Design a protein around this ligand. Structure first.
Ligand SMILES: CCCCC/C=C\C/C=C\CCCCCCCC(=O)O[C@H](COC(=O)CCCCCCCCCCCCCCC)COP(=O)([O-])OCC[N+](C)(C)C
Ligand SMILES: CCCCC/C=C\C/C=C\CCCCCCCC(=O)O[C@H](COC(=O)CCCCCCCCCCCCCCC)COP(=O)([O-])OCC[N+](C)(C)C
Ligand SMILES: CC(C)[C@@H](C)/C=C/[C@@H](C)[C@H]1CC[C@H]2C3=CC=C4C[C@@H](O)CC[C@]4(C)[C@H]3CC[C@]12C
Ligand SMILES: CC(C)[C@@H](C)/C=C/[C@@H](C)[C@H]1CC[C@H]2C3=CC=C4C[C@@H](O)CC[C@]4(C)[C@H]3CC[C@]12C
Ligand SMILES: CC(C)[C@@H](C)/C=C/[C@@H](C)[C@H]1CC[C@H]2C3=CC=C4C[C@@H](O)CC[C@]4(C)[C@H]3CC[C@]12C
Ligand SMILES: CC(C)[C@@H](C)/C=C/[C@@H](C)[C@H]1CC[C@H]2C3=CC=C4C[C@@H](O)CC[C@]4(C)[C@H]3CC[C@]12C
Lengths: 602, 602
């Protein structure tokens, strides 16, 4: 809807301009028409509450604008009035258009340096092609005009002014597309900070440094670190550099810089983890504490999955309580009742295995469920870097184990169902620990990108081929004796047999002792060419093409998963297992700060 | 044939020139021979009716040509006479050769600016390496000569002159290979238009704008739009531009610009759909109306295919009316007659499912058959972008359902045959709707390019291996008892078993309880190495290589299929479901035209 509305607003602005000789003269730069018309209403408006001076500024007409102020100087103070552009002044427009002389002329008339363009055209949104904040200084910074940024601070513009998101100009600058002035402009604006402006948080709680991390602005991140590094010594090709970890390690805060970076929705935030002080810090944390503890947690989880598997294998079963009648029934055994199920030393050993099994399902829920709420369910389940799909299946596993325990307590039949799903998802969730090892981590990401990519696309077109051919095979065999060829004997079996025949995992139905219907040979030749020969090998060809084009994305995602594991372990484990990282400054007279020392060759 | 004929014409032209001292002097530029020979027939002809002045112009000899006119000025007016070059003048030739002084000399003698070179050498065809139209002005435009184009219009050449295709010079220019003058030359020729010349249609009904769309000339399309855009405002990096949709949306016309573009045979016409106003218009139409309605039509078609499938599953069958005799017969059931087939509430429910099934087959034919005639059967079935092969199978489906209904009404046996083909093609045609979704559309094009590409090439060489080895296996087993190994028991079964063994979809024939002929082990080892190991994996290797080299073509074809779906839906659906797209100019005083407003960052 918003596009058609904005489109109408734009048409309606031009309609009023074209309808009004003052606004047309201001757009056209018709000095002669202004020199007639201004002598005989100056406060008349375009469709959004824009004045003739907004029009003159928009069409970049200094000559018209100086006439309009000479006739009616109060126009320099006027905001626009309607929701798209409300609060916008001719000063915001003169800054957008980089017209230094028109800006200085509006300031000479006393246009407000602190006016907020609060309308919907100025809010960070997918609707807007730019986000310059709401103040003339924020615009002057985002257009890169050093002259206008100085001229506005000379006229009393406040560098610490915040917009409707709480963004100061330093936050607005870090949100810009990477262009050469943006770091120059940040370094200029901090020269007027003489708490510091770069410590002011927005309404998300982000300081400009954390915003650079979340937004993936690696150029601004390196610029921010030039003032947090100290070059300790240089000797020949070697230098020792000491980096202040205060902002990076984010000590004692609920949401850390590293957590905000790994949990960011933006693709570019992974590149912050490859920036020098960050890369060495998370590397140290991983090789020192993270990998050792993750290998222990993997071992404990594998041992727990062996315990659960043993409790499935030794599950309590007795010879069935009724006779089998029809030859098609093969069930011979049956679930024991509670007071039959715990009557031997072997059951008492299985019972402690069941209690360990249930205890671990509770511990999974106690560890997982609080992090759904903190992170938000969309990010907690939806992020490859955090382990999103492994969170879905490990909670499903714990839910199915607790379902199995309430079924057991109730003497409820069919425990084999939740136990089978629990064994599959229980064991498949061991692949969460693949992320700890360079052999297996990148490959586990590649399997994930194949499942949510080429597998769903293949399975939709495969389902349509299966519905076609299974129906053809079923009705081809409906005339025939099902005991002579069973694969297509009823429609559910025909679907299942056709699915197995698509994958070639059962042999092509054959009985050379009998005359099969001629339409089967035809239909199977068409199915063998389309499903088996073409489609299944085209799935190989498709994944082969996807693999080489995904290979770098897979490796970046793996380096990000190691960091997200490191961050998660340190936040969740007891603090005595995670000593504070880097060098304590207090031992060396550097005050309360902590450092990373990096030595490098150049 | 035409090459050998033209070749003879060219040899015969040179033969006459070499035979005739006047024409040889005109080619050679032998001024001294002309200064002897011209004093004592000047109207004598080369093999195609060319004069000595045509020869002098062709060999680019101004000196000879001014002598020939000094002796016989009527030569400037002479056309060539024979079918290859009929109507060609020395003025057409002097323009081809860009000889401004020779052109101005022929015009001083009163050579016709409006002569038509109507012969076969000048017609748009695959025989001709250039198409410059038929008039000297059309040639002057296509050689890019601004001096000669001005000099010809100064001498009264008509810019609106049309050739045998109805092409004006603006159409001829849009047909040229993209070279720097072609837009300059179009912009020059419109400066003499002061209805407009760019509204004149050719004999296909195409104006120059629609011809640029059909021909895929994206450079001329962008040039044409520079005069249909209005830049509404510019502010900082943003601009709002208003594009006139009149030619693009082609409102109320039988064949629209967008339909002519998507239905074009030329590969380059897809690139027009990625040009700014077109791209935003078809995108709006798709996201606003096309995708919603296509998802409904997909749902209704899937529900219809479920209804038909249910009518196949519940088809009316009774226990056979005769005893089975030989053990090889497995048929136990049989088709019911009409007065047996509709006798229960379950049959009455199936009957309304059959009536819905038949009604939908009629509705498919009522929707499809008129579009065969309008589009032409070669384009309607032959285009990947329009859905050509899906039109073939969906009409085959409807034909087989109506065949099945006339069989049913006749009590005709073997309904299983058209029903099986109808189930396969009925369900496979659901993949037509894959084009609506980015997950499935590109992949459905890739399956199509594999079927008509690497699959036919593999299936021809596979058939030759199957004929070889099936014959070897059959005659190897002819000596042996068919009840001990059935796969090769007769030649049709040997072919079918060999085809299934090629694909590995049945197991290698084995019976370890008996002595198989030694020639079987040899022949199967050769078949396993050639068919299974080599050829079938070479099919995987081949499609893998085809896939990466086709991947971009596949994605362009998908973006074109979304537009062709959008265009088709809007033309076929009721108009109240497709409100006219863009902005009505009449609300804003812009007259009867409709616009797209585009906002962009630069
Ligand atoms: C599904 C299993 C149906 C079943 O349960 O099958 C049938 C139920 O209706 C069906 O076939 C369902 C037909 C529709 C299936 C196609 C739509 C699938 C969804 C597509 C999604 C896109 C149970 O009967 P039956 O197929 O065992 O035998 C045939 C029955 N006679 C012997 C008495 C004739
Ligand atoms: C075809 C099936 C033939 C059939 O119908 O097979 C035969 C008919 O002649 C054939 O074999 C056709 C032989 C030619 C096949 C090769 C050409 C195929 C086309 C190539 C295209 C390029 C029916 O007899 P039979 O093969 O069942 O047994 C053998 C008969 N004896 C036991 C009495 C000896
Ligand atoms: C029990 C059966 C009947 C069915 C219901 C179970 C589904 C299993 C096989 C499927 C469901 C989702 C799948 C799945 C989800 C996502 C990932 C993350 C990826 O990086 C590695 C593979 C992995 C871990 C796979 C493993 C197989 C799973 C767990
Ligand atoms: C990869 C995609 C295509 C997935 C969705 C495919 C699913 C189809 C082919 C498979 C998946 C589960 C299969 C399935 C589940 C269980 C049963 C019960 C069995 O006694 C009869 C067959 C029946 C009913 C089959 C029918 C075919 C199904 C539904
Ligand atoms: C019923 C059997 C015996 C035989 C005769 C039928 C043939 C089927 C299997 C074949 C014939 C042509 C094939 C075909 C034609 C072209 C296309 C377009 C492509 O983009 C997707 C696949 C698709 C839709 C395939 C699907 C499988 C089809 C429909
Ligand atoms: C992919 C290409 C090679 C295609 C054309 C291959 C076709 C051959 C191998 C297959 C397609 C259909 C098959 C086929 C159709 C139906 C029957 C009836 C059956 O009772 C005996 C075998 C017989 C006669 C087989 C013989 C082998 C055929 C003709």
């Amino acid at each position: 809807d918003w596009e058609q509305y904005r489109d109408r607003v734009n048409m309606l602005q031009q309609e009023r301009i074209r309808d009004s000789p003052l606004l047309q003269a201001a757009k056209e730069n018709d000095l002669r028409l202004l020199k007639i018309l201004l002598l005989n209403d100056f406060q008349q408006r375009g469709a959004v509450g824009e004045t003739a001076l907004h029009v003159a500024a928009l069409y970049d007409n200094l000559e018209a604008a100086t006439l309009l102020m000479e006739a009616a100087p109060e126009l320099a103070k006027e905001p626009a009035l309607c929701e798209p552009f409300v609060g916008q002044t001719a000063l915001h427009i003169a800054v957008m258009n980089q017209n230094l002389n028109l800006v200085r002329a509006l300031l000479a008339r006393g246009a407000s340096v602190s006016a907020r363009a609060t309308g919907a055209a100025f809010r960070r949104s997918p609707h807007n092609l730019i986000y310059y904040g709401e103040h003339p200084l924020s615009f002057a910074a985002c257009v890169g005009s050093e002259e206008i940024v100085r001229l506005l601070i000379e006229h009393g513009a406040d560098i610490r002014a915040q917009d409707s998101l709480g963004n100061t100009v330093l936050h607005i600058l870090i949100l810009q597309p990477n262009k050469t002035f943006a770091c120059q402009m940040y370094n200029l604006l901090l020269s007027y900070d003489e708490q510091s402006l770069e410590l002011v948080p927005n309404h998300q709680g982000l300081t400009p440094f954390k915003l650079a991390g979340v937004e993936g602005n690696t150029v601004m991140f390196q610029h921010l670190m030039q003032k947090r590094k100290h070059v300790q010594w240089t000797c020949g090709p070697l230098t020792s550099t000491l980096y202040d970890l205060t902002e990076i390690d984010s000590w004692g805060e609920e949401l850390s810089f590293l957590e905000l970076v790994v949990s960011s929705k933006k693709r570019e935030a992974r590149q912050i983890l490859e920036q020098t002080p960050v890369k060495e810090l998370v590397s140290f944390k991983w090789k020192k504490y993270g990998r050792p503890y993750f290998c222990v947690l993997a071992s404990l989880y594998i041992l727990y999955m062996i315990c659960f598997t043993t409790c499935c294998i030794y599950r309590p079963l007795k010879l069935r309580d009724d006779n089998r009648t029809d030859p098609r029934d093969i069930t011979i055994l049956q679930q024991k009742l509670l007071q039959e199920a715990y009557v031997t030393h072997q059951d008492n050993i299985r019972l402690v295995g069941e209690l360990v099994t249930v205890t671990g399902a509770v511990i999974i829920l106690l560890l997982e469920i609080p992090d759904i709420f903190r992170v938000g369910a969309s990010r907690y389940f939806g992020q490859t870097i955090l382990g999103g799909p492994f969170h879905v299946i490990i909670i499903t596993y714990a839910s199915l184990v607790l379902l199995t325990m309430v079924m057991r307590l109730t003497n409820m039949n069919g425990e084999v169902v939740p136990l089978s799903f629990a064994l599959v998802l229980g064991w498949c969730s061991v692949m969460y620990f693949a992320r700890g090892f360079q052999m297996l981590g990148p490959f586990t990401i590649m399997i994930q990108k194949m499942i949510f990519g080429d597998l769903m696309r293949f399975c939709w077109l495969m389902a349509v081929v299966i519905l076609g051919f299974a129906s053809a095979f079923h009705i081809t065999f409906q005339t025939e004796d099902p005991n002579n060829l069973g694969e297509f004997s009823d429609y559910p079996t025909a679907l299942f047999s056709t699915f197995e025949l698509f994958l070639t995992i059962i042999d092509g139905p054959a009985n050379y002792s009998v005359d099969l219907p001629f339409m089967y040979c035809i239909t199977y030749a068409a199915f063998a060419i389309i499903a088996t020969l073409l489609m299944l090998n085209l799935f190989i060809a498709m994944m082969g093409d996807t693999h080489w084009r995904v290979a770098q994305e897979r490796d970046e995602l793996w380096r990000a998963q190691v960091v997200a594991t490191t961050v998660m372990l340190e936040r969740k484990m007891p603090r005595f297992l995670w000593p504070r990282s880097g060098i304590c400054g207090y031992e060396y007279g550097l005050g309360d700060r902590w450092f990373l020392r990096v030595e490098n060759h150049h």
